[PDB]
Amino acid sequence: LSEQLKHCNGILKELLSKKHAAYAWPFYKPVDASALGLHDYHDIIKHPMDLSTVKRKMENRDYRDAQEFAADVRLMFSNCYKYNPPDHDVVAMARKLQDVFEFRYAKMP
């Protein structure tokens, strides 16, 4: 499972890499609801998640297994699908980044 966590870290590095930046950027940092004018965000999203938080948790050895890591990445996408109308540009970006994630997560050793 150290090996599986390394695979997860590789995925995380890929999600944060320039290769995917055109659609990954909304997920780099926590949603700043006040700054974005989304004053209902924290009434709708109980557990915010974003890639910088996933990165901090990986660096701190918070995740004990791949499944725990994947649950946080998927929570990040689910929050996006929950809050935004399905035709929002951010949702199209989420779907593309989640495709990157799911196909590489499936290659877990």
Residues at the site binding ligand JW4, with contacts judged by CB under 6 A: 26-27, 31, 36, 38, 80, 83-84, 89-90, 93
Judged by CB, which is closer to ligand JW4: 69, or 98? 98
Q: How far is the CB of 6 from ligand JW4 (least distance, A)?
A: 26
Give every CB contact of residue 7 below 8 A, 6+ residues apart in sequence: 66, 107, 108, 109
Is 77 within 8 Å of 98 (Cβ atoms)? yes
Give every CB contact of residue 105 below 8 A, 6+ residues apart in sequence: 8, 11, 66, 70, 73
Q: How far is the CB of 93 from ligand JW4 (least distance, A)?
A: 6
Judged by CB, which is closer to ligand JW4: 39, or 107? 39
Judged by CB, which is closer to ligand JW4: 83, or 105? 83
